[PDB]
From a paper:
To accomplish this, we generated and purified a construct that again contained only three repeats per subunit (termed ‘tcTRP93’). This construct was also expressed and purified at relatively high levels (yield ~5 mg per liter of culture) and eluted from a final SEC column at a volume corresponding to the same approximate mass as the full-length protein (left), indicating probable assembly into a higher-order trimeric species with 9 repeats total. The purified construct, also like the full-length protein, did not display significant unfolding behavior at 95° in a CD spectrum (right). This analysis confirmed a homotrimeric assembly that closely mirrored the dimensions, topology, and side-chain packing interactions found in the full-length tcTRP9 designed protein. The most active construct in our experiments (tcTRP93-VHH6813) displayed the lowest, sub-nanomolar values for both binding assays (KD and EC50 ~ 0.43 and 0.64 nM, respectively, and viral neutralization IC50 ~ 0.78 nM).
Based on those results, we hypothesized that a new generation of computationally designed cTRP proteins with increased repeat size (corresponding to longer secondary structural elements that increase both particle thickness and the number of buried contacts between repeats and protein subunits) would improve both the energetics and the stoichiometric control of self-association.
Author numbering:
A (entry chain C): 1 to 170
B (entry chain A): 1 to 139, 142 to 171
C (entry chain B): 2 to 24, 29 to 172
Write the structure that this text describes.
């Protein structure tokens, strides 16, 4: 395909951004951290387009692969905010992860409404992954709001996965 | 599809159990922990039955894919046990890991007797992953450290053996 | 189908990780020999497949070089062995060095998926190089490892814009 090639490139952007942030952190370099933050954002921004772009075209599977990159970028962006001192990036990484969590439920709702259980479960998996990042973003800021929101989002994915299990075992 | 869809749904139970676990682990709160423990504890029981059901028909993979969920479920169940200090739960999670390694050994031993090379390697991978959890469940009962080491020593011993047979062709 | 050999070598690297994590200075040396065997054996499968043609099995073999060098990197720390840091580093640079070439070859052929898979080994090798470099405090490798990621992000960033022209 063609749209997946960007996503595979975007995933390497988040990966190189994660490595750069880890090697720039301990030896107090803010320049590498300025790359890793910018590298992660655009991989999320480009994934945000491809997620929406694949959703409309009629692909809910290609959209999901983009939604995980929001999770992976918001995950890496949380560290850059955490390792540095920017309480401004943690405010953006949550919105990025929360968007993926919100969109996953939609594709889940649509896939379950169409009878595509497998595609639904992949959306439920990204729902749990977004809850994981949001939970992590909340323990080092002590905000029980994000930790509570993550609880229901993770719990909601839990029950829907329980339902798809019985629906298969008939 | 098929009962595989149950397993993929079961894997999400262990994943969601882990996120809840992490949350209540740090942010002091045992109500989530017993929910997440039960969530993780449940998918482990579900995976155990599908393993047996897959063993009988003939499909060893569905059995293997279920055995991996026992390893992944036992991992989350051990984690709550370490933080919550429940030395009894560390045991149930350990027994869960001990079964998957043992059951994989059969599928590993069985696949090698038929000449199905990578069906064995998939069982050997599940054996090494189960040995890994027990090491964590021990890192300090020194016997279990032998049990986890012993399982790790033999999965390695066979993978280099199976790799000698593949490189000649 | 040297692919079946590679998956077996990964179980060698994995069991070496379990044994190295547990510790017995004998076990740490048995895990060291276990991983160092799968890395030198992955190097052979890489060379043979890269020579006959196959650029994926070479990459699939190179990924175990990163993972074998990664597992051996821990044994170096837990045993206090700066001589071991050389082998784990030597493999990581090799996997990184070979990946760039395989990336270069794949880009000339139009196998953009293959380049990105080769570029992933660049980041995975660059991360290990960084990990091996913060342990002894060698800032030469820490810049070298940073550059490896800076190249992988830079080359993959083009493939992201070059591919969306036909989305």
């Amino acid at each position: 395909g063609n749209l997946e090639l960007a996503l595979k490139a975007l995933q390497i952007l988040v990966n190189a951004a994660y490595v750069l942030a880890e090697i720039a952190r301990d030896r107090g370099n803010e320049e590498l951290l300025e790359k890793a933050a910018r590298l992660a954002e655009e991989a999320a921004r480009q994934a945000e387009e491809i997620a929406r772009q694949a959703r409309k075209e009629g692909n809910l599977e290609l959209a999901l692969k983009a939604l995980q990159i929001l999770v992976n970028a918001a995950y890496v962006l949380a560290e850059i905010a955490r390792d540095r001192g920017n309480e401004e990036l943690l405010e953006k990484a949550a919105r990025l992860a929360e968007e993926a969590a919100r969109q996953a439920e939609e594709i889940a709702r649509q896939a379950r409404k169409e009878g595509n259980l497998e595609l639904a479960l992949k959306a439920l998996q990204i729902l749990v992954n977004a809850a994981y990042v949001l939970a992590e973003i909340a323990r080092d800021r002590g905000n029980e709001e994000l930790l509570e929101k993550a609880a229901r989002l993770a719990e909601e994915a839990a029950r829907q996965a329980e339902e798809i299990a019985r629906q298969a075992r008939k």
